Amino acid sequence: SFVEMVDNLRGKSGQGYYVEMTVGSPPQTLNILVDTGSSNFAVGAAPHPFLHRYYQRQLSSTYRDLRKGVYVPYTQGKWEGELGTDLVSIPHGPNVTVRANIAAITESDKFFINGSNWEGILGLAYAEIARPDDSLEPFFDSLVKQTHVPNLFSLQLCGASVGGSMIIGGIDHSLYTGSLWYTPIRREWYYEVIIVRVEINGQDLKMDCKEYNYDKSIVDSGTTNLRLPKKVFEAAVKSIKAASSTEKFPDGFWLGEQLVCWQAGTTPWNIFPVISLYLMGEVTNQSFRITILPQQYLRPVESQDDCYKFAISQSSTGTVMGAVIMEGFYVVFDRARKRIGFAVSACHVHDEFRTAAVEGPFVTLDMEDCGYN
Numbered sequence: 001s002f003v004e005m006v007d008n009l010r011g012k013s014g015q016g017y018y019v020e021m022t023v024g025s026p027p028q029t030l031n032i033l034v035d036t037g038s039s040n041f042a043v044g045a046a047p048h049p050f051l052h053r054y055y056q057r058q059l060s061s062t063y064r065d066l067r068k069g070v071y072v073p074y075t076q077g078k079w080e081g082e083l084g085t086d087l088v089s090i091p092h093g094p095n096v097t098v099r100a101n102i103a104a105i106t107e108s109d110k111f112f113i114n115g116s117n118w119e120g121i122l123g124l125a126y127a128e129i130a131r132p133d134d135s136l137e138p139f140f141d142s143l144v145k146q147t148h149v150p151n152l153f154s155l156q157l158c159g160a161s162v163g164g165s166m167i168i169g170g171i172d173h174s175l176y177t178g179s180l181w182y183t184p185i186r187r188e189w190y191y192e193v194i195i196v197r198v199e200i201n202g203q204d205l206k207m208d209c210k211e212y213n214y215d216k217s218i219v220d221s222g223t224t225n226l227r228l229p230k231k232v233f234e235a236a237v238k239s240i241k242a243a244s245s246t247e248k249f250p251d252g253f254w255l256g257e258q259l260v261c262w263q264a265g266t267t268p269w270n271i272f273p274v275i276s277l278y279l280m281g282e283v284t285n286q287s288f289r290i291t292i293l294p295q296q297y298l299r300p301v302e303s304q305d306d307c308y309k310f311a312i313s314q315s316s317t318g319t320v321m322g323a324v325i326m327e328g329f330y331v332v333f334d335r336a337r338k339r340i341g342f343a344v345s346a347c348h349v350h351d352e353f354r355t356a357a358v359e360g361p362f363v364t365l366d367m368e369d370c371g372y373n
């Protein structure tokens, strides 16, 4: 039932959203980072200074060794480990047990985060980007094939320490407002989508829309920032720079390298532009927009000052719509229908005079031109 899953995510601010799970017999309780940018289910199986518990394969009567090794690199860190299957369930999720692939993590490099409170990762993207190859069934596929849980999940990530909901197997209407707008998943590997226009405070950025998806645009609950290709990152920074030139910033701030602060309660939100991403819609020549507030891309970092880090950053692997984008929104991963839906969420962040928004329809000729091949 849906209400039982509402508020099943937690997290320390800047440190990820995790859901509670159990692996084994008898069940061992672990916190798992919820990650739509990858496809491997993996937990700490070995003492690590940043970890407070870990999976112990020898305490489980249902563990099965797979006698195959694995390694998974992310933008920001990596780990290797030993594959195997075991029984798994989600306390605050659907009321089932499945046998799934689990990577037992034995060494890692900049992957676990100090004091984050999660010991593992749930990659919810598709088989094709699974390691070591697409034959390792991802958790969610196993979940669907072995139960009657419909092939769909939704994420409401609340920022504003950090909380939210993962509704597994449907949509809870009491968590968003207005209507859901859908964008096709272009290809089932990452959650790849096509961005057809970008505006900053109502001004078209006027780049060739191939640039917005060079070389892909993905939706990713595992990455903090809105990450943009070099060309797009530079046009954006130049605009945001010019809209808030009223104020004083060391330019390593623009690079995410230092903070800016303000006498508490005086942050000048008004000089930071709203950003609109226009996504491919579901019908010919049709798109829609989602608009984020500066409260989403200036993240409060923990004096009686308010300090913020700039959370838009460069990438050479295409656009990443990370938690900065997703925290405004109720995001539906309709795998069954190959689409991703957005609505303003209930826990939306609050400007005095401006609102995070999902709006349509819009006309956009030549949307197919926008995909990079």
Ligand SMILES: CC(C)[C@H](NC(=O)[C@H](C)C[C@H](O)[C@H](COCc1cc(F)cc(F)c1)NC(=O)c1cc(C(=O)N[C@H](C)c2ccccc2)cc(N(C)S(C)(=O)=O)c1)C(=O)NCc1ccccc1
Residues within 6 Å of the ligand: 013, 014, 015, 016, 017, 033, 035, 036, 037, 038, 039, 072, 073, 074, 075, 076, 077, 078, 110, 111, 112, 113, 121, 129, 131, 220, 221, 222, 223, 224, 225, 226, 227, 313, 322, 323
């Ligand atoms: C297996 C495959 C699908 C893999 N997937 C990915 O890399 C996707 C895009 C990234 C994942 O979402 C991956 C999974 O998240 C786990 C993680 C947490 C870490 F602290 C460190 C890590 F290394 C990893 N996330 C990140 O790489 C990542 C995490 C963070 C980050 O801070 N994440 C935390 C947990 C967080 C905080 C708040 C909200 C959500 C998440 C930040 C970044 N940035 C780059 S940034 C500064 O925001 O621009 C990236 C991939 O594509 N690899 C390609 C590759 C190969 C070799 C080398 C580099 C890249």
